[PDB]
Amino acid sequence: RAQASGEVAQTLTQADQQLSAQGDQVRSGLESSVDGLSAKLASRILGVDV
Amino acid sequence: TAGRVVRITGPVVDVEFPRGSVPELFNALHAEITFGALAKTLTLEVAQHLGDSLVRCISMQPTDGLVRGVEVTDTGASISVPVGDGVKGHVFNALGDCLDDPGYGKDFEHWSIHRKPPAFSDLEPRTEMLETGLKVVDLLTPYVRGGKIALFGGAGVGKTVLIQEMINRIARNFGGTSVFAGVGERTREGNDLWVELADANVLKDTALVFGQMDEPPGTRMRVALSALTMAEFFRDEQGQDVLLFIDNIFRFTQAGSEVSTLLGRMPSAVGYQPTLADEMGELQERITSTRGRSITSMQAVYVPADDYTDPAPATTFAHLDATTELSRAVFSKGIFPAVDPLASSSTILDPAIVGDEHYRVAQEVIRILQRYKDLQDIIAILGIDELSEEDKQLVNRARRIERFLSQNMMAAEQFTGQPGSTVPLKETIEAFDKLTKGEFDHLPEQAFFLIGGLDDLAKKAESL
Amino acid sequence: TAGRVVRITGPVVDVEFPRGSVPELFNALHAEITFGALAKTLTLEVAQHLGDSLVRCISMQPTDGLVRGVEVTDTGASISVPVGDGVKGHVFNALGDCLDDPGYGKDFEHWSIHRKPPAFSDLEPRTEMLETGLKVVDLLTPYVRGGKIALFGGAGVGKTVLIQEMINRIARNFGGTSVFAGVGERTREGNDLWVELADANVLKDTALVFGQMDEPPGTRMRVALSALTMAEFFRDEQGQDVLLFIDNIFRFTQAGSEVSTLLGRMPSAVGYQPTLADEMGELQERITSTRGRSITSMQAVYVPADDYTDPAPATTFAHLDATTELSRAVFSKGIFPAVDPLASSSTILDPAIVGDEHYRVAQEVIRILQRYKDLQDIIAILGIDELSEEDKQLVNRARRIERFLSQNMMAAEQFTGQPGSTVPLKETIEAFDKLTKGEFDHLPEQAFFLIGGLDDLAKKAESL
Amino acid sequence: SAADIEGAIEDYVSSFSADTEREEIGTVIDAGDGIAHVEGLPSVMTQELLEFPGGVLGVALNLDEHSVGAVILGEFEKIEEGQQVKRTGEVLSVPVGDAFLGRVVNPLGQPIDGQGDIAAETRRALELQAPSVVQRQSVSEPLQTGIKAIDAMTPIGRGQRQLIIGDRKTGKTAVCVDTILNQREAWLTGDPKQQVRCVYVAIGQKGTTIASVKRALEEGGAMEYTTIVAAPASDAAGFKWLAPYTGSAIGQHWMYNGKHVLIVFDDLSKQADAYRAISLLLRRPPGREAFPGDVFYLHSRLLERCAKLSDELGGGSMTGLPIIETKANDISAFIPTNVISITDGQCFLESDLFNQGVRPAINVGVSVSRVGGAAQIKAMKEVAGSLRLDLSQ
Amino acid sequence: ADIEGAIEDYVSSFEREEIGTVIDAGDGIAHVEGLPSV
Amino acid sequence: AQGAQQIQLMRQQLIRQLRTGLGAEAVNKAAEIVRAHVADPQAQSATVDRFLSELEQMSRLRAASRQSLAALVEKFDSVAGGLDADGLTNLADELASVAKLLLSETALNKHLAEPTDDSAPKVRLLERLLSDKVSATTLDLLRTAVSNRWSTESNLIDAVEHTARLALLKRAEIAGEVDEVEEQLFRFGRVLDAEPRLSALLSDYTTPAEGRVALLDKALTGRPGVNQTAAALLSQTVGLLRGERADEAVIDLAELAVSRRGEVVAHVSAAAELSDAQRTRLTEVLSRIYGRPVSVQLHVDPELLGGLSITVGDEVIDGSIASRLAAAQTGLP
């Protein structure tokens, strides 16, 4: 059980590092759309093209 | 001319009417809840006239969804329930609507659930014993045919089990009509009773009325009256011998307490409504049996806080011929069905009715048990070995009597596994007479626990 | 603009504002008293909105001298206290005004005494044991580091002395900071604690917030929140480990009760505020330790009339990781720290946390003491002489165990002159294992009073 | 990882709309201690949800000629006079669905575990009527708690309402958490007729205790199928009063879809205190022990919704393990006896027996299960038919 | 000045039969407006 | 398996954090965009017109008091139908005077408002007290008011004050200033809504009402532009507030003035003064929706971000662009 907990902790830390890096990567992709998404939302609230 | 909901406070609704159309007290009014999830027709019972053409009503269904200013129409008559031979074999709620077959009694004769009790000129005391088959009841708390019977109990001491057993013992072979009124009891027990009656083919002779505890105070107040109206129709309009089981009658008074403060009444002792005694007296006096017209009523009376000095049980005690008092102290000792042999009483336990042998045996049993109860304090500290020889013999006999008053009941089969048993009255008298004279002091006390009869006593003595 | 005082009812002041300037709840308002010796700027805390642009407020200084119609100016923010490393080593009142140096802290950062409790996601259960050196605490009620500890007790049983003992045992060598919050104990005790901490050189690491008995209820119910805001700042902004001594959180509930009576809210069971549980939860869920940052808290709880069923002790019991219920019965026997071993408990007395041996010894001790308690009436009437030999031996070693749970606390040196001891946990476990096994049941009972250890036990045995 | 990061925002923006409609709005005239009186709102329903501007919700309890007395369900520090109160148009209700498994939620159903929003299937009103007498069937399927004393002497069946009652630190929460944990073997079966879902309603418990319970369930795998409706002691009296009903609604949603639920209420004694506080703040005159007259109703209305539905209604069930804290070992108090009379049994955990080494500490004599053998497998019924009465003797 | 005298005269003004009207009625109690000589 | 679930939860947590960040940034950018767009006057007018197009496709008295007040207003109509401007002014002044008398002489009001059926003693008391001081019409109105029963003593003062207001309202109607009085009363309503401190000072009824009316004359009603009838109404109301706030009292008086002509007031909030075309369109559409002619009271609130909002009674139609912005911001998953 201790060995299983240790290996689970190891894979958890590895996955945490990998997911943090991959989220840092996908941050640029999200920022690539942020502007168009904001424009679309503004147009939707106004009921007309922004 | 119709009303208008002005003020809503939980189960209490105030309704304003035009000055010329204020409904009478206890009239039924119909409001409407239109919210989809809770849409319904809400039956209000006028409880007070509070001036300026405002009435104050106790809602029967939950008021959740009711809107201020919603129109309230006046029926012109009090809450009415169906009556007749038709209501037998069916389940109704407080309002008289059928549960197992909706729209069943919509065209039966309808009686208002509010009526004055029978005139004092029509009352005749009942002095005929009702043989149950339970040792303790038959010996020390002999029930009355046509009288009023009670099962007083704290919380979870077996009132429902014992009342179901009482249905099993009295109603199975009863040639009359039964009416069971679930007044704020547990719904699971109501369903078990319904299925048990259907299985035994007693349902066709029984009409069930349920006001279970999920319902608001109004239904828990008026369900007792709704069932009692069917009982009164069977008593008066048909001359049938009637059985009227009620469980739990205290939920009636308790329900009145819940709306007591919202109705504007100052609370009496222990937080009960000031009209506790008057309301309970009306309801209980409606249950009596006039001469030539019998209602054998049995009511389970909840004792709050296991306190028999509480106002509700104390006020109810005056309304009963026999009172089987269940105590948690006895229940804790394994002695099912929980009866305190000393607190319980009966008005027919007199030598002129039950006979000299029965009276002598019962009263000697009470003497032994009271002496044992007094000695318990001494024994718990000084030890039994320091008691008198006569007192030591009495303590042994008292333990055997306490354990022999226990019985394997039919309804308790699922508590003990073993099947139910019935002890004839003569056998109970003989067995307890022998116990009191010490003809069974040689048997171990555990041989007397949950046996029900002398043959079972001998068999269990052999098994030990 | 400003408002006007419209009603004054003891320490409660109603103030009317214009329509658009009504202050938010818990804002600080400044009124003026101009009469001679009572002149002062009076801090009010908004407690309710009454409508018509009135807010009902709690005075932090006594209102004696306040005049109807006097201008009230709202500060626009809740009562704020200074926070920072500079707050340590100094004495503050509920309002954050320093007493050792009156002008101190005005240039520090100020934090509202009112804030939301830590988010549920930030909480995790603490399970590390805080070894104190007291036998009873280390054995039967292991204190939790980063958890909540309480010391319940009637008047004069030793709550404050044990608080001082734990300041001497925990705070003395603690790496992090400490906060002591008087919440309605004696000003004499506050001064004694201040001088003791200065003498022990622990003052530089601890912040003292007092608001003692003589203060009005508002002060006595916000001093806990002020000290707690200081502790929260140390927990969150400095990342330090924090001790938080409160004596007495009952006086916070009692001040709340007084205010509620003055605020016109209907009383609860025994006169306490209807919001008793809500107020105590708001106060004590802030004291919790979030994930990576610990705040150990030790609270004295006054139980009024030695009644542990009182709503205030009962409400606070649910909030505590470890409880030490001081009992009058144990105190009268001279068994200091007067802990009732059976009523006191800890959440970490679990074999998965303290180990198999510690748990087994603690449960054997509790078994012996509970059996001794069961025999209490027989011992009172007839004494040990009538007991069975097994029970006689058990009672002998139960008396020896109960007396060996007593210890010579280092804070008690001021009373009995005897120096205080410290028993490591392993030695406590071994000694109580031997006691429960009877290895010491030949020594006289007197050898175990206030001895604190095995070597000291042998020395005192030689002395006798 | 996926395009959902931008896809969800795109879908929300494209589908977002705030079409105007008549709001029927009132104004606060009095607020404090979690109670707010609202002038206006002519068409507000009783127990309607009112939206205060800070996103805070209240429940319209009192409906007088002048004002609406609502109980703020959440942070009431932001409610002030002159403040603008919208009616939600829906009776007191909570979101429900399978998405609540493994989540810690407020009595309003919104999460407090820090994870994402819950994709509720629908909304269920908290005050829907309990199953009637003709809609139930006898309790006959055992609910294995894993504790010999309970499963032998006071068996708990599916559809039963077993009260765990006792003083402080007598093993109550331990019993309930062990019962929840023992259902993992059934959950892994994948059969809805065997799976028992759980809802642990924490009332007036400090947050760290609910976190400890959640960690105990995670370490046992019970959070795969257990929901926690947490009303920590910090939360106002409204949440502590509403949490049992929110748990009951979440459980009932599964109950009426043919699934078996187990509901723990920890403690109903703290719900009674919160309801007392709410009623006194609303200025309802109290009854005995300062409690409202409706305090019995409060529990029955709740506990009676735990039932074994008939086959016509799907066969589902909801088992209730209400927990009551007795003061000074007095089982004869008001609320204890109320719940004892509302439930189908007791497990009276006594501190005396707990200290004597009897763990789980069931007082055999006082404890009872009115379902009895019907909630036991035939082997257990045969082996322990008279065990409880034998131990009492 | 004349207010007190006129008020007293009106009060004194309050062999004809006296009949009141029920205004409230609930729980066995009835409030009856009028009947000044009751 | 528990570790696998833990890493899956970590992944979902990261996904949700990314979504939250992206949504917050997008909504903030959209808020900036909409704030910029609404700044244009033509664009703001376009938004208002679009909102009107969207619309285009869509008391405190119990039974006894209610009936008695209805009868009192009916008799007031019957009697004052043939009155004159001077007569109506005298009626209003004397009704205000007797209201003041009843307010000050609490015992006199308590005896006068006795709900008993026998009205003759009450009428005799009213005569003996007040017959020689007032005119016949006001005396007859007061006698009928006292004859009918009232649910509370305060309701008699409420009714006499209501009749006093109706007297001045009929005076204005006869003179033809019905619209001017309503609008100009609304003018003071808004004025007293601002400078809230003043509203409190007027609300003080403990101090003699002479000081309150003097304050009102010095501050508000002493100017030449104030309509005489509305000034009399304001003075009458401030002299009889009896705890009702001055601002609320004046706005309620304006509501009564519009109600007496069958219309209902609608309070409209906009970012800027709406033009005449959209003003008349709004009035027509609001009348269509509420089935009753409406009078719109505009309020300039630039914080709404260029939208339009309406409140009628207890109902609110919120088309404000700021409201939609808030809904979008709080609507993030």
Ligand SMILES: Nc1ncnc2c1ncn2[C@@H]1O[C@H](COP(=O)(O)OP(=O)(O)OP(=O)(O)O)[C@@H](O)[C@H]1O
């Ligand atoms: N460990 C001890 N050793 C010796 N004497 C003690 C000890 N604990 C308490 N006492 C005695 O009890 C007295 C009261 O102790 P303490 O000040 O701690 O009381 P308390 O329980 O906090 O009560 P209060 O409610 O008055 O604050 C001490 O002054 C001393 O006389």
Ligand SMILES: Nc1ncnc2c1ncn2[C@@H]1O[C@H](COP(=O)(O)OP(=O)(O)OP(=O)(O)O)[C@@H](O)[C@H]1O
């Ligand atoms: N069967 C058991 N065996 C051993 N230890 C137990 C058992 N049941 C409970 N305990 C322990 O006894 C104490 C009782 O804690 P528990 O949470 O079960 O009590 P509770 O009834 O919820 O109390 P509280 O009123 O403090 O919430 C804890 O130390 C628990 O670990």
Ligand SMILES: [Mg+2]
């Ligand atoms: Mg002290």
Ligand SMILES: [Mg+2]
């Ligand atoms: Mg617990």
